[PDB]
């Protein structure tokens, strides 16, 4: 797996692969 | 949180999973 | 035929721009 | 009913994505 | 809506959502 | 079944790389 | 005829995207 | 223009719409 | 109908995250 | 057989993408 | 064609257009 | 290689093709 950096929509895009059958929560609040 | 952890520093596979329900 | 998995790749990308500052949950 | 259903089998505007945020 | 920053293809990608039924013009010339 | 909306998401992304410096108009 | 038509219902090379720029 | 406005500074919803015809 | 070209756009994007450091070949 | 086949006509987990790297 | 910069997944995404009927090899090793 | 060439400096069409088989 890609062990560097993952910003913008690609951070959200990766959460769709990693979870997949589970779904993901994305909370950026500081 | 999510952004603090993976966009600022090095992230991982089995813990961006942590964010799965 | 309209695909569950592939279509959802754009839905999560769009919700990133639409919600933005507030956040969002996803469950397929 | 549901974002999955309502945005894959017909197109969605920016106001119905606002129905599904947080 | 996301009130920060929007560069590269994501700037063009957002113009497909925001407009949608209208289309968009993209002119970068300095 | 081939979808008007979803396919167009890659068309606008590709035209960003193909045209590049010059620019492009889109109308669906 | 048209990018919509000609690049969704059959695949498109990098030269026919060059037909539709500005 | 488009890039000057939203990539350099903070952009908005109802004016990247400005770029719609 | 499930499209050879469009589906492959997400496959190459996912292989970028899955393989990552090692690399990958693609042939359609 | 093949990533093309096995990840387009049915969905794929992160472990079968690991079958196709380098 | 876009003669500037092309990083992250977009570098891989462009290799899918440019090659297309050929495929592409992506080797990042320093 | 690939990343050294196009992410660090200006890339081109007919040589990111170089990476096609
Ligand atoms: Na797609
Ligand atoms: Rb990006």
Curated annotation (Swiss-Prot), chains D, G, J:
Disulfide bonds join 7-12. It comes from the Eukaryota. This is Insulin A chain. The chain holds residues 89 to 110 of 110 of the full protein.
